[PDB]
Paper text:
Co-repressors NCoR (NCOR1), BCoR (BCOR) and SMRT (NCOR2), which are components of multi-protein complexes that include histone deacetylases, associate with the amino-terminal [name] domain. Work by others has demonstrated that the important interactions of [name] with co-repressors occur through the amino-terminal [name] domain, which also mediates homodimerisation.
Here we report the identification of a direct interaction between the [name] [name] domain and members of the ansamycin antibiotic family: rifamycin SV and rifabutin. By plotting the chemical shift change (δΔ) of the most shifted peak, as a function of rifabutin concentration it was possible to estimate the Kd of the interaction as being in the order of ∼1 mM. To explore further the atomic details of the interaction we crystallized the [name]-[name] domain in complex with rifabutin. The most important interaction appears to be a π-stacking interaction with the aromatic ring of tyrosine58 of the [name]-[name] domain. The aliphatic “handle” or macrocycle of rifabutin makes electrostatic interactions with asparagine21 and arginine24. Specifically apolar interactions with tyrosine58 and electrostatic interactions with asparagine21 and arginine24 are involved in the binding of all three molecules. The binding of rifabutin to the [name] [name] domain also appears very similar to that of the small molecule, 79–6.
Author numbering:
A (entry chain A): 6 to 127
B (entry chain B): 7 to 128
The structure:
Amino acid sequence: ASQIQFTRHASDVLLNLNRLRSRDILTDVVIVVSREQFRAHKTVLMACSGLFYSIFTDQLKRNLSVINLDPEINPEGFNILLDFMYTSRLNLREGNIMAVMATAMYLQMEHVVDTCRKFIKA
Amino acid sequence: SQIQFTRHASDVLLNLNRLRSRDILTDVVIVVSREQFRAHKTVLMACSGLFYSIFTDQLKRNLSVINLDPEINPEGFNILLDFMYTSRLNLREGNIMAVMATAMYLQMEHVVDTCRKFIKAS
Ligand SMILES: CO[C@H]1/C=C/O[C@@]2(C)Oc3c(C)c(O)c4c(c3C2=O)C2=NC3(CCN(CC(C)C)CC3)NC2=C(NC(=O)/C(C)=C\C=C\[C@H](C)[C@H](O)[C@@H](C)[C@@H](O)[C@@H](C)[C@H](OC(C)=O)[C@@H]1C)C4=O
């Protein structure tokens, strides 16, 4: 009896999820940041973000197809964090470092916060 | 941005598996013989060519129940489902032929290749 672990499977799935997202397949939510719209899978959001996890665990909010993020959240930093959720890659530049950390703190992605803090420190 | 955080994909899959066991946002029942397996369509689709084709056909895309072909055995399907959500494929001499046959059906060819090696080791 063997329990075989496939070590790039998790990477393969997340990659596929991203492919479904870029074709807009089975995306079941629109996140509204200021007034820009991002389509996403609820399940991915919850799997990465303490905020979205909190929200969608509420059996009431669970079938909401629209979510209005707080208005201090800028769309640029959100889009970067959405890309990270889906790619495990974080586009960090001096120009965006601050908007990314604030958005991450807000989404409760604390490992993203702490790599932003590590970045800050050239 | 050159750096990827490979464990992230693993966190993501770990949390999707959590949602599944809590039955949060599961949106399909897969029916295998007379056995029901709750799941998320996105995850099935990201893991199986067959599921990708089913959930991408508009006549099938919007049903909460999907029946697999009658020949498919429930023990085999349960192992593949666990694999999709954990990356671990649990093979036993008691389950192997049905896992192979079920993985072939689901067009999961790397899992098929690993079953053949186990039978050769057995
Ligand atoms: C890593 O990704 C692979 C599958 C993952 O696994 C699955 C389970 O998750 C998927 C995800 C998340 C997807 O988004 C698609 C598919 C699958 C899976 O199957 C597809 N699967 C088929 C569905 C069933 N058969 C086809 C047959 C029955 C007609 C197999 C593929 N088509 C598929 C699609 N779209 C298309 O075909 C279209 C509109 C265009 C394709 C253009 C080129 C030709 C490709 O892009 C090529 C350069 C390469 O990228 C793919 C061929 C790649 O294959 C690999 C590993 O080289 C898959 C996308 C998809 O968008």
